[PDB]
Amino acid sequence: GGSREAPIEILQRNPDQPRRTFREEDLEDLSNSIREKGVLQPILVRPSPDTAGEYQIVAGERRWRAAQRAGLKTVPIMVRELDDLAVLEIGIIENVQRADLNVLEEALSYKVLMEKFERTQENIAQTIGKSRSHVANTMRLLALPDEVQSYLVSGELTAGHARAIAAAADPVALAKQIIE
Amino acid sequence: GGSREAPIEILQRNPDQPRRTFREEDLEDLSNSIREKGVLQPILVRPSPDTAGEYQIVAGERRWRAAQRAGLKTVPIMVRELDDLAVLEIGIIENVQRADLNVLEEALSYKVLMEKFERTQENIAQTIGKSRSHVANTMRLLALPDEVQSYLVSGELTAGHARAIAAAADPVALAKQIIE
Ligand SMILES: Nc1ccn([C@@H]2O[C@H](COP(=O)(O)OP(=O)(O)OP(=O)(O)O)[C@@H](O)[C@H]2O)c(=O)n1
Ligand SMILES: Nc1ccn([C@@H]2O[C@H](COP(=O)(O)OP(=O)(O)OP(=O)(O)O)[C@@H](O)[C@H]2O)c(=O)n1
Ligand SMILES: [Mg+2]
Ligand SMILES: [Mg+2]
């Protein structure tokens, strides 16, 4: 059994899904991102244990909720027979076994969009489903010295602190201030 | 066009993929995780622009490399016609449009594996493809006071710092020390 488009309305959440909390800010970004390029990773479901002809989401609740807000009529699914232990395992694995992109690898990606493909920071924001603010701030990090970038490449400079350092009117000045 | 199993050997990487660096530590965890439950999210590819009957990975290089080390003969793929702008966009989106699990939501998930399903910390480690160390340290956080957990629930307490705080013989003592 491969992956198929299926009517969004015949899908339901597992209450015992490892993820409890869902921030509006993030869900808005995903629904925006889905409105543009659609649902890119198919949603993992098992046949519903409670209701007939329904599917219980094993992995991809945010995708389902985002696609709902985005007003998509169908979603891509993969149906696999799974017991309650399998689902909890998979639920953890999909979210735990994945490496985040370095904020500089992200910034460089935006540079290439601008230079090689002549995309404005607005064009980028609209396509990737993030704010013009986030894009601008992310790219400003490319200005910083090689040494401070090496701190972000290494992780020494906190990834959270990076977005803050970027927002500053005098961003490079906050490099030495990071020590204290 | 859905998703199909395809021989791992007819897949190649895009050199211009947003992600440049690949840490051995993480790739080992993924290959372990894949050795157990296989490749859970199908790998997004376009028909190779250079070589005939080959596919260029748009999203899922780590999965491909992990599955390779894991000695998988086939991998699940989805083939879509995509130009160089599409691929760079999608490459960014799949990695940028996704929310990480709270370290406490992770710990609780492991608790339920132990209590509801009678899994040892070794059983968990083997199935999720992480270290017994990582599992033990992650669960120890559930012991900590509601106040310091609120710091991790909020994010104030660095998620990386959490596993370290947990390992400490006197973990709660690091709460006031989080001033610096
Ligand atoms: N047994 C597993 C473990 C993990 N994953 C998935 O593999 C992906 C790993 O994400 P990432 O670190 O970004 O690597 P890839 O997407 O494989 O590669 P890249 O982003 O570099 O293209 C995640 O979707 C995760 O759910 C999976 O399909 N099967
Ligand atoms: N246009 C987009 C944007 C993002 N994604 C994918 O949506 C997932 C978001 O991951 P996460 O934040 O964990 O949410 P879900 O996996 O959807 O939900 P859950 O983990 O709660 O099951 C990622 O694999 C990302 O590649 C996608 O398919 N299409
Ligand atoms: Mg997920
Ligand atoms: Mg990825």
Author numbering:
A (entry chain B), B (entry chain A): 42 to 221
Give sentences copied directly from the paper behind this entry.
In most bacterial species, faithful chromosome segregation is mediated by the tripartite ParA-ParB-parS system. ParB, a CTPase and DNA-binding protein, nucleates on parS before spreading to adjacent non-specific DNA to form a higher-order nucleoprotein complex. The ParB-DNA nucleoprotein complex stimulates the ATPase activity of ParA, driving the movement of the parS locus (and subsequently, the whole chromosome) to the opposite pole of the cell. ParB spreads by sliding along the DNA, in a manner that depends on the binding of a co-factor, cytidine triphosphate (CTP).
Next, to gain insight into the spreading state of ParB, we solved a 2.7 Å resolution structure of C. crescentus ParB∆CTD in complex with CTPɣS. Hence, we modeled CTP, instead of CTPɣS, into the electron density. The asymmetric unit contains two copies of ParB∆CTD, each with a CTPɣS molecule and a coordinated Mg2+ ion bound at the NTD. In contrast to the open conformation of the ParB∆CTD-parS structure, nucleotide-bound NTDs from opposite subunits self-dimerize (with an interface area of 2111 Å2, as determined by PISA; Krissinel, 2015), thus adopting a closed conformation. Each CTPɣS molecule is sandwiched between helices α1, α2, α3 from one subunit and helix α3′ from the opposite subunit. Ten amino acids form hydrogen-bonding contacts with three phosphate groups of CTPɣS, either directly or via the coordinated Mg2+ ion. Four amino acids at helix α1 and the α1–β2 intervening loop provide hydrogen-bonding interactions to the cytosine ring, hence are termed the C-motif (C for cytosine motif). The C-motif forms a snug fit to the pyrimidine moiety, thus is incompatible with larger purine moieties such as those from ATP or GTP. However, in the spreading state, as represented by the ParB∆CTD-CTPɣS structure, α3 swings outwards by 101o to pack itself with α4′ from the opposing subunit. By overlaying the CTPɣS-bound structure onto the parS DNA complex, it is clear that the DBDs in the spreading state clash severely with DNA, hence are no longer compatible with parS DNA binding.
